[PDB]
Amino acid sequence: EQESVKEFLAKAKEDFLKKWENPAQNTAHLDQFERIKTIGTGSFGRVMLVKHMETGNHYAMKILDKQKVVKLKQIEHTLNEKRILQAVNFPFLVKLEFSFKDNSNLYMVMEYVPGGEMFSHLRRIGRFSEPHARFYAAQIVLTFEYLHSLDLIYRDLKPENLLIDQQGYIKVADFGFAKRVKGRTWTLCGTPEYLAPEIILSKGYNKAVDWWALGVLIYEMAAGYPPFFADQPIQIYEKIVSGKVRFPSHFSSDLKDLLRNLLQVDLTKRFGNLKNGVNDIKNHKWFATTDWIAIYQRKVEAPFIPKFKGPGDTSNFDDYEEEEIRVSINEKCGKEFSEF
């Protein structure tokens, strides 16, 4: 079993490396897409539903203002985002279909994933049952196994970054702080409720912070709220570094035991970071019902299938204030974003 894993991932590395050292580049242009509706927003620009006209397929195109990226000192991060994303391939990683730039903008046309954000479903329903959250957790366990094995750290796991597709399965969108590193890294980043303690204490950290972020996700999915919360960030970091977590009463004993081993402050005793590796999570009593190969294969019945009134339907996403894409007649930031 764990030698299929070894072999699967070895082949995946042959694949991921070819694309890593020679990235796809300028495989489309703006005016080949019909811009329909803003379906989400981040700090860098908007995400829109678009239809590719020659083929009729719908995608989500993420626009990033080059100048806003610079001001935000996210230039190396945004080259990381695209290079990493064009190069990976896994069922639970949102697909980067096309990418290109103009005078004003960076563009990242991805798989349109019509089911909505884990986030807004989690907040609507309140909280997931353990079986339900396990289904999702399993998909994040296998994805991180895939990512970590290619020397990637994801670094921004949250419900906001997980998109449910038609079959109720998951897609890790947003790769804005993912990073290929062997050894330690120091950038202060992620989202406050999910930061590992070593990230807060400016210590220098590794892939184990994704594993801790796995714990927060699962807790948040099963409790309805995160393990450490407050109104300001600085009070969240107090509660994180303090090394105490109260569990809801309805939490099963096995689930509390996974979380105690995931949201472990001490790196030498934290699941994912030990010598057995990712399997101290896969073979854990909480995932005893979980058939990892069937999860990979898409064979299991999702516990929730999003609503789908047809192609180009945006009802599982919010509405947002529309704004024109403007392309300056002069090139901005060409030296900096050259390799995009």
Binding site: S43, G176, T187, T191, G224, D231, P233
Partner: peptide
């Protein structure tokens, strides 16, 4: 309850990442 404290907090919407 812990839930009530949370839905009454200011961090129930989409959460931004930090920059440094």
């Amino acid at each position: 309850t812990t839930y009530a404290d949370f839905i009454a907090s200011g961090r129930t919407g989409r959460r931004n990442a930090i920059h440094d």
